[PDB]
């Protein structure tokens, strides 16, 4: 009977001089803290029990109390930053790192979990866990010929804790820590368990969310083809982080973007740009907008893969955030594209949805659309066809919108719109 | 994924 103990009874048992009474009371605490309904974390903290639990972590001759106190401290560290800090302040970090080497797998796993919660608080505790030396023993647990010999839940918890050591910015994780973790991360990215794949992908997405040097560290390990394969997964919890990572990577240099293209990513975008999950569609369109900001041959590969009609589709009908990203993709396309590429854009039907979006309450999207329209008109000039385009815009009703924009609040807006009128509709 | 999680 360790069920429904009072905190006072727990304190009584833990303050006894009897390791087995302490074990019973720690288990009672664990059971209080592992209920879903409002676990009494703060009451346990106020009772002063964290130091006792931390001391129990070191009791090698009573592994049950190591496990029970590890679980209790895990659940305390799962709370607010103040509660996690309470666990850190009691000395828990080195004690958990020492438990990583336990011969009992359920105890090492519980230490992995606790360290995941501590690191998940934020950059400072993440880096403090690293400074206390957690990475080496964590990776040692994964240094096996075949990850399949490990228990599924254990492997999942190891992957998740590793992902938290890769998470967060200001600052990003230490460069040497990333380099030390990456080979194991790449091995996890090839594992067959959906949750391991998802959390590995999330870690890779964290590591690519930064300057081009971080992106390059990742790309050099050769993960882009595997990311593209996972971009094609049926499980949405895998697609989402794989797509996040791909989008991050194409924020980099034209060469890193080209590595994404060469791996076959564009072939997946017909489905991504029509995906029923709004956030997938939005992130896919954001990624496209960064690809169309690249080189003219990269725009050409966007064309060859049949993706301009899919951008026309998103512009015609999508969540408004997705539509704004699509407008960005079009402006980048027209800013970097050849005359022929811009003409092709017009032939795909861009004008009417582009115009229909000008009645938006968002000023940024209006600016973006007007810039795109100007670039298209410049290509038309280069071809001597500006009247055709003006007639198109007028026939679908866009000229009325542009005229209405003459009396717009923002300076750039009415500057742009009256330039258009005086230059092409006079 | 969550930043933290309790064991229930």
Numbering used by the authors:
A (entry chain E): 72 to 497
B (entry chain C): 436 to 443
From the paper:
The W proteins of henipaviruses share a common N-terminal domain with P and V proteins, but have a unique NLS bearing C-terminal domain that is recognised preferentially by importins α3 and α4 (KPNA4 and KPNA3), rather than the better characterised importin α1 (KPNA2). In this study, we present high-resolution structures of importin α isoform adaptors bound to the NLS regions of HeV W and NiV W, providing insights into the molecular basis of importin α isoform specificity.
We observed binding patterns that were very similar to those seen with HeV W for both importin α1 and α3. Crystals of the importin α1:NiV W complex (that had P212121 symmetry and diffracted to 2.1 Å resolution) bound residues 436–443 of the NiV W C-terminal domain. Both W proteins interacted with the major binding site of importin α1 and α3, involving residues PPTKARV of W and ARM repeats 2–4 of importin in both structures. These results indicate that the interaction of the henipavirus W proteins with importins is highly conserved. We found comparable binding using microscale thermophoresis (MST) assays, with importin α3 binding NiV W protein with high affinity (4.4 nM), whereas importin α1 and α7 displayed a much lower affinity (681 and 696 nM, respectively).
